[PDB]
Nucleic acid binder design. Structure first.
Ligand SMILES: [Zn+2]
Ligand SMILES: [Zn+2]
Ligand SMILES: [Zn+2]
Lengths: 65, 48, 1103
DNA sequence: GATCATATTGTCCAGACAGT
DNA sequence: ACTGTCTGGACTGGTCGGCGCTATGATC
């Protein structure tokens, strides 16, 4: 539901640059170039960033207490 | 043996005694479903 | 003009799925049942006549209110599905039926009295969630992506699986090879009652008629004479006028010439039904049997009896032609002869049964009230008298119970099942599920196998395994189910179009017969012209799209069929005229712009719904570039023939059919964020993936279905390589660092419920920590997590047999009993939430949801989307795992032996596509038959700087040397299943035993044992291990000692008070011996003695 | 209001049996 | 002595998990 902190393969941190990547993707730019300029070169980290979908915003609306 | 409870919908604190409760509900909004609040005693969770 | 592209057709299909949805059959069927089905049932029942002289009560209009619930105090409040689920309440709405008393033939003032509560389908027209936006559903605790279409009974979601039954009031003909006879059967329906009327012709040429509740098949001529026809000529042209048919009829009535009058045939029927009875009693019994059993769908009055003979004649021809080769045998599995009973029809039947029982209960109530109080109190206030003589719950407890246990009236069972909530895919699959009335153990070679009429209606791959294979299917993505329309309007339209009525013109060989819903209505001179005119009118929007017309033009017989009933599964097809499809680029542009909807496209006749009967006259083109002048239709989406879970498989055409079936079946067993409101849900078992991911190689339909919003798996960097033999035999090897980094991490939630039930005499349960002085005290440390109110604190670590809700029960026949709800002995975790509310009776109800972190380990089942499944064989550290020259360490390692044996090339294509998508950043389309070509994927992989085959140079993680072979490594979507080793490990040494057989209990929840079945005993005998078998079956299961009398072999009685052992049947206070045997053998001896059988145990010395 | 007797009587293979 | 017909019985094992049901119309 939230972006993982590190890549599952090598442990490279990706949560810092995920929201910038998502914002640039919504602007219409090619996600490959966005990943390239963000330092995400290995396709395992690219797998982690691309395949992740944000869902925590739809879980926060259901309060539990 | 009365205790404080949290409402499911409004979320405000609801106070009632379950031992001698003729009916358990939130008087503020009429909701009949309540949540038991988490205790403030510190709990320790192992990181992975 | 261009010949269109599959992208435009995909856009049209997406618009179709957006407009209608995926649970449209349930919602439409329930809406039809609500709008008129209740009214139809009420009008069918009509009125109730109690035992009151010159008085009756008739039924008026029946309406249904908003879903509301009345508490124990008496307050009526609006009810929501989340509240019903949490508080274990049935989501139902009151039914108000107005009653008009009739006194001396004068109608009185109508009385509106609630007759019960009817359960409400989720997201239906009568539901509170109808028309609500996503924000409104969120504010009510409901997932906006939830499709609805199910029922909530006692807080549990219930889904009505559709039933694939035979077409009602339709005669199907087949030949029995073993019996050497031609048999035709019709399942006539009347008010929920089904009668199987059979007409057969044996080797002797005679015709027999089988009627239910009749023990022997009687002659067709006898029933034909008893049905109203007297002379032989009447039976002669009641069937046909073909000379061969006439000669067969002459032979039949010559053989059956012994009976000439109606009374003799009725006497024969009554004698066969009830032998040894007076003649007039047999006569009236036979008359009632003929009226209420012989084709009830034609009516029950004797006036239509003659017409029933006509319906007999059309049966006889169907028997005769197949016996003479004029016509062929129709397929029983053909979907033109198969209907789909949806939730609406079953709800109508259940409501009819419940309303009939309520009517009889009300009749008894008014009879009793009139007999007790008298005429003065009855007629002084007729409004209050009728209202007080009604018990609504009597109806309600018949409806919801049938929706609770799944048992339907009439012997039908399994209609309603628990809705699958494993993930997003399972719920949709269950809501689009079709079962069959055939037995699961029966080998149905002609029924379980896939049929050619299942194209576009039944998913060809997504079927269960084992005995459920074939008999349980899923609706296709393009499958559409018809909604009922008034048949009288269709019949009037057909008559006004030029169809001569049957009663006006007799059937002729040169005339085209016209059938309406399986009933012959007349003949026309030009059947083809009539069919073309009907199709043109349907395309012009003059008539509804429900009507489907087909023409059967054989050299012998010619027929026209018009179908406008329920249960017909149809598919949308683009109409093609003169080699040009009706769908143009302008229609696609209007669909994309939003100005045109799917219903608009149906209105202009560009795309039409075709059932199995009409499609027999259609010539469909698979692709837009394959259309010719002879083609009559164009396929919208060839990939839409698959089901919802089957479309999850990327490139299913590159995989074997059993592999695709396994992948579709295991898509429902995966774990992920199925629902956004999972935390507030009170499901008894649930799973959550910590970091779910949408697959990089996904079909475009999954975006429209909603799987991308609710993923149920993760993308795994899988390298196909043999690693130390721990991936052998379908096993997989996982990376320790990947698991520690959160890959495939899951949480399992279990919900326990405790109710403060109230017993007779004012005794009730109490929610408090039990005192140590009372009996049944589990232990001091077991209540350490309880509060002063007897409820567990949230976020508290718990273990096996840990007390969650402290409950005390009143003693049976002493101190209060202990009935605390505890965690399962083999389960643990952390208490996630505690909910306190009340049930329908006002008693307190506490639901505790406990969550356990499930880190992947050995034995955890992981499956690919192509049927490749296996448990984790080893948790290999990252330093020991191999790595490629590009610096990629695989997250999973699979054996290379499993890939080619199961013919799974789609897995390799998906790996290539996943690597390409990761490297390029653009998602790779994996849709069936329109996906990205494999060669193109290899081309872009080459252009990206990698090998075309996907192989990479890898170095060993232990030795550090380069591997001599280039290892194929790519991104494959691997999903974790719910078959975790945590919930599957069972270990019992000793514990509870059954009260009957003194044997270990069943299952794992009650610390049961493991069954040593008959086969295990057989192989132990084959091994020659006598003492091992003795230790297993006897010394460890039910070992016991008994006293046996040597004089007669009876079981001696031992008295502890007297302290002596003696045989009561015999005496013999001395010759008694102790024998060691199984308690099951003692139970068998007791059963034999109860069955009046005396077993005499002749004892022998051990040496 | 709180109790209480009664609560209805699918196929296929193999062995035994009237019929000719 | 043959022949079709009526009647009777069985339909692989095991396991995980859930759902749900086992009263009522008179009587004082
Ligand atoms: Zn990485
Ligand atoms: Zn509240
Ligand atoms: Zn004895």
């Amino acid at each position: 539901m939230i972006v993982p902190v590190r890549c599952f393969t090598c442990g490279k941190v990706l949560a810092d640059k995920y929201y910038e990547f998502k914002k640039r993707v919504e602007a219409g730019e090619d996600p490959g170039k966005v990943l390239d300029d963000l330092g995400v070169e290995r396709y395992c980290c690219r797998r982690t960033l691309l395949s992740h979908v944000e869902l925590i915003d739809q879980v926060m609306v259901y309060k539990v207490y | 043996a009365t205790a404080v409870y949290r409402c499911a919908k409004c979320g405000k604190e609801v106070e009632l005694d379950l031992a001698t409760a003729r009916e358990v509900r939130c008087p503020y909004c009429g909701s009949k479903i309540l949540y038991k609040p988490r205790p403030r005693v510190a709990r320790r969770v192992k990181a992975i | 003009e261009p010949t269109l592209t599959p992208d435009e057709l995909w856009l049209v299909m997406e618009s179709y799925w957006k407009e209608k949805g995926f649970v449209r059959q349930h919602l439409d069927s329930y809406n039809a049942f609500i709008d008129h089905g209740l009214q139809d049932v009420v009008n069918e029942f009509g009125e109730v006549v109690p035992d009151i002289p010159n008085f009756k009560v008739k039924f008026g209009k029946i309406r249904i209110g908003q879903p509301e619930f009345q508490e124990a105090q008496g307050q009526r409040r609006p009810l929501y599905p989340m509240d019903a689920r949490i508080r274990n309440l049935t989501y139902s709405a009151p039914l108000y039926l107005e009653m008009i008393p009739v006194v001396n033939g004068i109608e009185q003032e109508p009385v509106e009295v609630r007759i019960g509560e009817l359960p409400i389908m989720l997201k239906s027209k009568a539901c509170r969630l109808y028309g609500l936006s996503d924000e409104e559903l969120i504010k009510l605790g409901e997932d906006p992506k939830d499709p609805g279409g199910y029922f909530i009974i006692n807080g549990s979601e219930r889904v009505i699986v559709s039933i694939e039954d035979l077409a009602p009031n339709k005669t199907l003909v087949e030949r029995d090879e073993r019996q050497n006879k031609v048999v035709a059967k019709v399942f006539s329906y009347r008010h929920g009652y089904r009668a199987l009327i059979t007409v057969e012709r044996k080797k002797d040429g005679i015709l027999y008629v089988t009627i239910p509740n009749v023990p022997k098949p009687v002659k067709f001529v006898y029933v034909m004479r008893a049905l109203g026809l007297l002379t032989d000529k009447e039976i002669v042209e009641a069937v046909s006028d073909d000379p061969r048919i006439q000669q067969v009829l002459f032979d039949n009535l010559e053989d059956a010439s012994d009976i000439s009058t109606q009374e003799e045939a009725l006497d024969y029927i009554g004698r066969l039904a009830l032998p040894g009875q007076p003649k007039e009693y047999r006569l009236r019994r036979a008359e009632h049997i003929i009226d209420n059993n012989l084709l009830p769908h034609m009516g029950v009055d004797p006036e239509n009896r003659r017409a029933k003979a006509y319906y007999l004649g059309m049966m006889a021809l169907k028997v005769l032609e197949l016996s003479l080769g004029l016509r062929g045998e129709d397929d029983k599995d053909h979907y033109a002869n198969k209907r789909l009973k949806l939730a609406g029809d079953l709800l109508k039947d259940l409501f009819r049964v419940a309303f009939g029982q309520l009517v009889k209960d009300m009749q008894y109530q008014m009879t009793k009230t009139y007999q007790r109080k008298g005429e003065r109190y009855t007629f002084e206030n007729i409004q209050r008298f009728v209202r007080n003589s009604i018990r609504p719950d009597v109806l309600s407890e018949r409806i919801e119970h049938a929706l609770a246990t799944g048992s339907w009236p009439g012997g039908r069972t399994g209609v309603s099942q628990l809705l699958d909530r494993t993930n997003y895919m399972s719920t949709l699959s269950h809501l689009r599920r079709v079962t069959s009335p055939l037995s699961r153990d029966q080998p149905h070679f002609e029924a379980r196998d896939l049929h050619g009429t299942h194209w576009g209606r039944i998913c060809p791959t997504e079927t269960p395994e084992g005995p459920n294979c074939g008999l349980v299917k899923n609706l296709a993505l393009m499958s559409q189910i018809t909604t009922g329309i008034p048949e009288r309007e269709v019949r009037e339209y057909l008559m006004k179009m030029g169809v001569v009525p049957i009663e006006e013109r007799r059937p002729a060989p040169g005339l085209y017969r016209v059938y309406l819903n399986g009933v012959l209505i007349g003949t026309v001179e030009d059947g083809r012209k009539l069919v073309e005119r009907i199709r043109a009118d349907r395309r012009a929007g003059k008539i509804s799209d429900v009507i489907n017309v087909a023409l059967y033009e054989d050299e012998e017989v010619k027929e026209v069929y018009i179908n406008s009933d329920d249960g017909r599964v149809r598919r949308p097809l683009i109409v093609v005229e003169n080699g040009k499809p009706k769908l143009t680029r302008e229609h696609v542009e209007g669909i994309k712009n939003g100005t045109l909807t799917w219903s608009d496209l149906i209105r202009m006749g560009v795309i039409e719904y075709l059932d199995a009967e009409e499609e027999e006259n259609a010539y469909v083109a698979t692709w837009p570039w394959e259309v010719t002048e002879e083609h009559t239709h164009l396929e919208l989406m060839p990939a839409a023939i698959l089901g919802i879970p089957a479309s999850l498989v990327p490139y299913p055409e590159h995989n074997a059919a059993p592999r695709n079936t396994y992948g579709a079946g295991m898509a429902k067993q995966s774990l992920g964020l199925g629902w956004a409101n999972f935390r507030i849900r009170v499901d008894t078992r649930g799973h959550l993936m910590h970091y779910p991911q949408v697959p990089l190689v996904n079909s475009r339909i999954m975006k429209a279905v909603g799987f991308e919003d609710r993923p149920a798996g993760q993308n795994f960097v899988v390298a196909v390589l043999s690693y130390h033999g721990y991936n052998m035999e379908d096993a997989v090897i996982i990376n320790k660092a990947s698991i520690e980094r959160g890959l495939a991490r899951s949480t399992f939630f279990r919900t326990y419920e405790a109710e403060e039930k109230r017993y007779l005499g004012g005794q009730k349960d109490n929610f408090e920590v039990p005192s140590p002085n009372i009996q049944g005290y589990l232990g001091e440390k077991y209540y350490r997590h309880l509060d002063e109110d007897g409820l567990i604190f949230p976020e508290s670590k718990v273990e096996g047999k840990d007390v969650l809700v402290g409950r005390t029960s009143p003693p049976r026949f002493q101190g209060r009993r202990e009935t605390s709800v505890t965690v399962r002995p083999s389960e643990k975790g952390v208490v996630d939430k505690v909910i306190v509310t009340e049930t329908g009776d006002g008693t307190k109800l506490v639901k505790v949801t406990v969550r356990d972190l499930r880190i992947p380990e050995l034995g955890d089942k992981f499956a690919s989307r192509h049927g490749q499944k296996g448990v984790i064989g080893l948790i290999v550290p990252q330093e020991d795992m191999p790595w490629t020259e590009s610096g990629i360490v695989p997250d999973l390692i699979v054996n290379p032996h499993g890939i080619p044996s199961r013919m799974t090339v789609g897995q390799l294509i998906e790996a290539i596509g996943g690597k390409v998508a990761s490297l390029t950043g653009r998602r790779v389309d994996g849709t069936a038959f329109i996906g990205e070509p494999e060669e193109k994927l290899r081309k872009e992989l080459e252009e990206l700087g990698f090998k075309h085959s996907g192989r990479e140079i890898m170095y060993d993680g232990i030795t550090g040397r380069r591997l001599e072979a280039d290892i194929f490594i790519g991104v494959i979507y691997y999903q974790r299943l719910h078959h975790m080793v945590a919930d599957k490990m069972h270990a019992r040494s000793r514990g509870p035993v059954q009260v009957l057989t003194k044997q270990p209990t069943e299952g794992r929840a009650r610390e049961g044992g493991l069954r040593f079945g008959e086969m295990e005993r057989d192989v132990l005998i084959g091994h020659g291990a006598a003492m091992l078998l003795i230790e297993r079956l006897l010394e460890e299961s039910d070992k016991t000692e008994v006293w046996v009398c040597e004089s007669c072999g009876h079981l001696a009685l031992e008295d502890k008070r007297r302290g002596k052992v003696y045989c009561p049947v015999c005496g013999e206070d001395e010759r008694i011996s102790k024998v060691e045997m199984s308690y099951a053998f003692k139970l068998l001896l007791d059963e034999l003695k109860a069955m009046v059988i005396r077993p005499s145990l002749r004892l022998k010395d051990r040496v």
